[PDB]
Each structure stands twice: as structure tokens, then as C-alpha cells.
Write a protein that binds this DNA or RNA. Structure first.
Ligand SMILES: C[C@@H]1Cc2cc(F)cc(C(N)=O)c2O1
Ligand SMILES: [Zn+2]
Ligand SMILES: [Zn+2]
Lengths: 456, 222
DNA sequence: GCCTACCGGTTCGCGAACCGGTAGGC
DNA sequence: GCCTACCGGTTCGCGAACCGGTAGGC
């Protein structure tokens, strides 16, 4: 990391490191019962100590010049151990009672709608606002990159909570994981106590947070880099970083009428809170997504299905394709385990865009997902391994798009019929879900841009 | 936990928030707990007991609102209770309990300042260590646990976390660590404890124990 | 969280005093 | 042969000063 500007000597003297270990650590401590939720940043520029309650004006600091450079190591490693409990070097860290825990820090030639697409998916201040509702620390998280091993442990703590919640474990067991999580990931609750992770959807909410938070740091990783040479334009630099060939499907096109039909037709009767309005249609072609999908063009039963996600995620979804949840993450929220989920209805998928009356525009996908021999399920069931010969899973719903009006498209079955009753009604799903447990089975075809019309 | 706090001045150093003069040592003083601007933690705003009631604060029921009320001396509790404002068997057991509650309050206080007269802090520290007790930080708190130890008994370790239980207002709270991340939350009015064993070194133990002290359990507020 | 007045425990500084060696007087 | 006024040097006694660990304050 760089120098903390609270010292006032940020662009004057560099932060020091002895060969490998950088003399700079950001500690944290939270006790849900007491309500304390604090930070403690230590640095060696001069020694600098910062402390207070995370996400508020509560706190103070002490910049202090040393007599010498060897006295700095003495003052630094002493202050460190006094606060954290451990020595500066260690094989594995161990938390100590009421001591702190250290956090692991690390002229454009394109169409106007395509420029707006980059404008929409690379505005990171919009992604910052998106995290404000989650209560993630807004102050130093953009400059302070939280480690990958750290976030995996944060995922692991969430998965431990769901396990603890499922079999009604002790309050202390839950208290620990709630403490552990908020220590590991600094939250901003202001002057009130961190809430206990006791619910089934509270872990899901914090699981979704980590998924979104990750994609913002990924969006930064794309934006920060490349070759800054005076030749290409700023928007073109970010376009090439997406690693995809995006084209604008004209409204006069015959295939464009099919999508607008697929949008208009497959709106849910129950999801009457909003009304869609297709602003644009983009034909999308990822880098080498056809090379990996070649195997599954042999596979039968290929369907063109909807998949919605936050506008923040589309920065990463274009660059890496659709990805399955990590193995450390919790299975909560998912109906049939971790995998890429799809819907035959635009509305059901459109809810995952997370739009409001203030933020109207939203992005939804259409991918040629090779379902193949399907494993049909009625009730929710967390699966680990698929049955033999099955390449996908299907959640059977009450309403299904008319199978006698299934139009084809480039050798892909598009179920754009209106809703009718299904074959079986002993299910706990209202609409269909299509699940693939392999990132190769999906092949993204179209990216849409949708305006939502509410009534308030 | 509580908003307010009352105790005898642990030092004649702290100033009074209203009048800004030094609150003298061992004097009745009251506080209001506020959020410290300098660090993540509550801090007491100490007032002179006289000055506390002119700022405009009106504690309806001190015993349930103010912290450290039960630890005060019996006659001093009544001063707070009055100044805050400005059937046969039922009333008998009610009245006779308050008789036994005073009996227990000023029994410990007689025992407390008896040890303060005769014993130094190091003697009281080594008293607790001999009885396998955690030595607390603070002068007042040391003889508070020694007096608790002698009258009722040497507190046995906790059931799960193996820590030290401590009397706090209305119950014995566990102060140990169930884990490194979290504190233990065991609480009880009837804790486990063996008998208090004073070492041979006590030429005034016959004088202190001669103050009509028989076997009895901790009595609590209603 | 960090600052600092307070506590006990030891050292330090300096003048009184103790003391032995001595040279001028008778 | 004593006595004794004078001087250099060691000890002794006691209050000032020093100091590290810490309970209380904000
Ligand atoms: C992962 C969730 C579950 C789910 C079901 C579904 F039918 C569609 C979606 C989606 N992202 O459009 C979806 O996202
Ligand atoms: Zn006052
Ligand atoms: Zn315990």
C-alpha cells in the first residue's frame, strides 16, 4: 500500500519495507455484544498510528518522528505486538483476546450505443453507490485492495454461519462467526451495533455483497492497466480490455423482431411491478467462447435463455464469461446448488438487474446454453454431483412458455410463447429455471439494454 | 451497558463537567457515559454528586438505571434514591429481606475497610492468588473480591471456558474467553465455589472473623 | 485508543562526622 | 616522651531525584 494522507506527508517520504515484509499493517477489532467496531492502521514512513471507529469521524491519529531508523523498527514491532498480540514475522497468525487482527491488504471510432455500453459498465462511482446499501466501508476500500485469500476466508465464515443456522447451533458459535466476518470485512454501521448473522437470508445478503464487491475490484483491474500510448482513444482502450466483439443489431433487422417478441411475450403475470422497454439489442461475441463451446454444438436440446445480473457485474461477465460461484461460498440462495442459472422468461431474469425508479436502465443477457439431457426437479434440492448421462438440471414451474409456439434461431430453440399451465403441478416453483454446472456449456449470444417503467 | 454510573472517586484527579473542579478522592460522584471523539469507546463524564442534578438529568429509578448502585454503601444508596426524586406475609418477607439486604451490604463494607486498615495491596493480591483467583486491576476492585471471597467463598473456575466469575450488581458474570474472538456470556446467581482458605499468615484474622460472620449465600435485589 | 499523575523501589548526591596519620610545642 | 590543633580521606545517613509499570481520565 501507499502512504496514508492523514499523516500529511504522503507526497514527501515513501513508506518503508525491509526487503520483503512491508512495514505497514491495517488492523481491526469488533465485538458485537459491546458494539465496538474499530480500526487501527500502523505505518513506518517517522512512525504513523491511526485509530478510531470504522466509517465515522470518531477516532484520532499520531504522526511522530523517530530519533533514528533502527529505533523505528523497535517502536514499530513493539506497538504492533502490543496491539495485535503476535510478532511481526509468523508462520500462521493467531487471534488473541481483546487484541486486534491484521487485515490482508494487497476521436473514438465506435457506435454511439456501444460507447454508452462502456459508459454504463465502467462507471465505477455508480458501482461504489451500489455498495453503500450493503454497508461496506466506502472510505478506503477503492484504494485498499482486500486480498484474495482474505475474501475466501470471508466466504468460508459465511458458509460456516449457514451450517450453524441450519442445525440450530449455539449463540456463541454464531456470535463468533458474526464477529469474525465483520473483523475480516470492515463494515460501516455508524454509531450502532453490528447485527448478528442469524438468519438464512442474512448470509445470502452478505454472500451477494462479496460477489458484487469482487466484480468491482475486477472492474478496477481491467480499467487500471494496458499500454498508455498516444494513439487509441479512451473508450477504445476500455473496449479492447473487455475482450469481446460487440455489434449493434438494427431495429429494422428481422432477428431483432424475435428478441422484442421474446421480451414482450415472456413477461410474468405475477411480476407486474414494472414494465419493460427494449432500448437496444447488442450481438455479443466473447474471445474464444466459440472455441470452448464447439464440444456442445454436438449436444442436443440447445435453448436460447435469459440471464439477468447487476450492471456492476457486466464489466466482469464480458471479460471472463459467466462463472460459477466459488467452492468457499455458501450454497444459500441457490435452488439447486452452485452453477449458471437461466430463465425462459425475461421478467424473472430482469429482477436480477436490480433497477429502481431512480436508476431505470438495466442489462440482461441471452445465451445459447446447451442443456442437453435434462435432470428435471420439482422441489428445491442442493445437488453436488449430477445423475449419470445428465448434462443439466431443470426446475419445473407452474407457468411455461407455449411449447407448440417454440420458434427456432440459428439452430437454437427460442421458447417465446406466452404462459400456459405445465404438465405437473406438484412443484414449489412458479416459473422455470435452467441450470448448467460447467462454464463451457454457456455461449452468450445477445446483450440487451432495458428501461423499466414502474408505477409510483 | 448503562447510560449512567455512580461510585466513590477512585482518584482525586478527574474534574467535574459542570463546574470544572477536581472531584476529590473517595467522594460520591455520578457520571453520564458518552461516545469519545478520540477513540471507539464509551467514556464517563464525571460530575460532582451535587452538580449532577442541575444539568437537567432525571433518573426515575436509580437502582435499575444507574450502574454501581448496589456496590455503594447502604446509607449512600438512600441519598441517591431520595435525591433522584428531588399482604401480611407479603409485606413481612418484603420488609425482613430489606433488613437482611442492609445486613449483607454493610457486613462486606465493614470487612472491606477492615482489610484496608490492616493489609496492603500486595497482601490482598497474594490472598487471591493463594485461593486460585484472578487478581483484578484496581485497588477498590481487589478488596471487593477478597471481601466477596471471604464472606461467600473462593469462586471455582467456569464450567465451559474455565475463566473467572465476578460479582457484578445483580449476578456473577463470567469474564473468561470461550474463544479468542468472543467473550464468554455465562451468568448466574448461584455459582460453584469451595470454601475460602486464608493462609496461616494472619494475626488479625481472628479479629476480622470475630465480627459475627456465619455461613450465608449472596442475597440479590428484588 | 493514548496521555500522565501516582506508587514503591532503588539509586544518587552531598554534607556531617568519624578517624588515623602527623608535625609543631612543651 | 606526651598533647593537640590541623588536614585528607573514608564512611554514614537521609532526603532529592530517578524510573518503569500502571490504574485512572479523557
Ligand atoms: C442465480 C439466480 C437464480 C435464477 C433463476 C433464474 F430463472 C434466472 C436467474 C437470472 N440470473 O436471470 C437466476 O439468478
Ligand atoms: Zn462540580
Ligand atoms: Zn465462562
Amino acid at each position: 500500500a501507499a502512504v496514508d494522507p492523514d499523516s500529511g506527508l504522503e507526497h514527501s517520504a515513501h513508506v518503508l519495507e525491509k526487503g520483503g515484509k512491508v512495514f505497514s499493517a491495517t488492523l481491526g477489532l469488533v465485538d458485537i455484544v459491546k458494539g465496538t467496531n474499530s480500526y487501527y492502521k500502523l505505518q513506518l514512513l517517522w512512525i504513523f498510528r491511526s485509530w478510531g471507529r470504522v466509517g465515522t469521524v470518531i477516532g484520532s491519529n499520531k504522526l511522530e518522528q523517530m530519533p533514528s531508523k533502527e529505533d523505528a523498527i523497535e517502536h514499530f514491532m513493539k506497538l504492533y505486538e502490543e496491539k495485535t498480540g503476535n510478532a511481526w514475522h509468523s508462520k500462521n497468525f493467531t487471534k488473541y483476546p481483546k487484541k486486534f487482527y491484521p487485515l490482508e491488504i494487497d476521436k473514438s471510432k465506435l457506435p454511439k450505443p456501444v460507447q454508452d455500453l462502456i459508459k454504463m459498465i465502467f462507471d465505477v462511482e455508480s458501482m461504489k453507490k451500489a455498495m453503500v446499501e450493503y454497508e461496506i466501508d466506502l472510505q478506503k476500500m477503492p484504494l485498499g485492495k482486500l486480498s484474495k485469500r482474505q475474501i475466501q476466508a470471508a466466504y468460508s465464515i459465511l458458509s460456516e454461519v449457514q451450517q450453524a443456522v441450519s442445525q440450530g447451533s449455539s449463540d456463541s458459535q454464531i456470535l463468533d462467526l458474526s464477529n469474525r466476518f465483520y473483523t475480516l470485512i470492515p463494515h460501516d454501521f455508524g454509531m450502532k451495533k453490528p447485527p448478528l448473522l442469524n438468519n438464512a437470508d442474512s448470509v445470502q445478503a452478505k454472500v451477494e455483497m462479496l460477489d458484487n464487491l469482487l466484480d468491482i475490484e475486477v472492474a478496477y483491474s481491467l480499467l487500471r492497466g494496458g499500454s498508455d500510448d498516444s494513439s487509441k482513444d479512451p473508450i477504445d482502450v476500455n473496449y479492447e480490455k473487455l475482450k469481446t466483439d460487440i455489434k449493434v443489431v438494427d431495429r429494422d433487422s428481422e432477428e431483432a423482431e424475435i428478441i422484442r417478441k421474446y421480451v414482450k411475450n415472456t413477461h410474468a403475470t405475477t411480476h407486474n411491478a414494472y414494465d419493460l422497454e427494449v432500448i437496444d439489442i447488442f450481438k455479443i461475441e466473447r474471445e474464444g467462447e466459440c472455441q470452448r463451446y464447439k464440444p456442445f454444438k454436438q449436444l442436443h436440446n440447445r435453448r436460447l435463455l435469459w440471464h439477468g445480473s447487476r450492471t456492476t457485474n457486466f464489466a466482469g461477465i464480458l471479460s471472463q464469461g459467466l462463472r460459477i460461484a466459488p467452492p468457499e461460498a455458501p450454497v444459500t440462495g441457490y435452488m439447486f446448488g452452485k452453477g449458471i442459472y437461466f430463465a425462459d422468461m425475461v421478467s424473472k431474469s430482469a429482477n436480477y438487474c436490480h433497477t429502481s425508479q431512480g436508476d431505470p436502465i438495466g442489462l440482461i443477457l441471452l445465451g445459447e446454453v446447451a442443456l442437453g439431457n435434462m435432470y428435471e426437479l420439482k422441489h428445491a434440492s442442493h445437488i453436488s454431483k449430477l445423475p449419470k448421462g445428465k448434462h443439466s438440471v431443470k426446475g419445473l414451474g407452474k407457468t411455461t412458455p407455449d411449447p407448440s409456439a417454440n420458434i427456432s434461431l440459428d439452430g437454437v430453440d427460442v421458447p417465446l410463447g406466452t404462459g400456459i399451465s405445465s404438465g405437473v403441478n406438484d412443484t414449489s416453483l412458479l416459473y422455470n429455471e435452467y441450470i448448467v454446472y460447467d462454464i463451457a456449456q454457456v455461449n452468450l449470444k445477445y446483450l440487451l439494454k432495458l428501461k423499466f417503467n414502474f408505477k409510483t | 451497558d448503562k447510560l449512567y454510573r455512580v461510585e466513590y472517586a477512585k482518584s482525586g484527579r478527574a474534574s467535574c463537567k459542570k463546574c470544572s473542579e477536581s472531584i476529590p478522592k473517595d467522594s460520591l460522584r455520578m457520571a453520564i457515559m458518552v461516545q469519545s471523539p478520540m477513540f471507539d469507546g464509551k467514556v464517563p463524564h464525571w460530575y460532582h454528586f451535587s452538580c449532577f442534578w442541575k444539568v437537567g438529568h432525571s433518573i426515575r429509578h436509580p437502582d435499575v438505571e444507574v450502574d454501581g448502585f448496589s456496590e455503594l454503601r447502604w446509607d449512600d444508596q438512600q441519598k441517591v434514591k431520595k435525591t433522584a426524586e428531588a399482604s401480611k406475609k407479603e409485606k413481612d418477607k418484603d420488609s425482613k429481606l430489606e433488613k437482611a439486604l442492609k445486613a449483607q451490604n454493610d457486613l462486606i463494607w465493614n470487612i472491606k475497610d477492615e482489610l484496608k486498615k490492616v493489609c496492603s495491596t500486595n497482601d490482598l493480591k497474594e490472598l487471591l492468588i493463594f485461593n486460585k483467583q484472578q487478581v483484578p486491576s484496581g485497588e477498590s476492585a481487589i478488596l471487593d473480591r477478597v471481601a466477596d471471597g471471604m464472606v461467600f467463598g473462593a469462586l471455582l473456575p467456569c464450567e465451559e471456558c474455565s475463566g473467572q466469575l465476578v460479582f457484578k450488581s445483580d449476578a456473577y458474570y463470567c469474564t473468561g474467553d470461550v474463544t479468542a474472538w468472543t467473550k464468554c456470556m455465562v451468568k448466574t446467581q448461584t455459582p460453584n465455589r469451595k470454601e475460602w482458605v486464608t493462609p496461616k499468615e494472619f494475626r488479625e484474622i481472628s479479629y476480622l472473623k470475630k465480627l459475627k460472620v456465619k455461613k450465608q449465600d449472596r442475597i440479590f435485589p428484588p
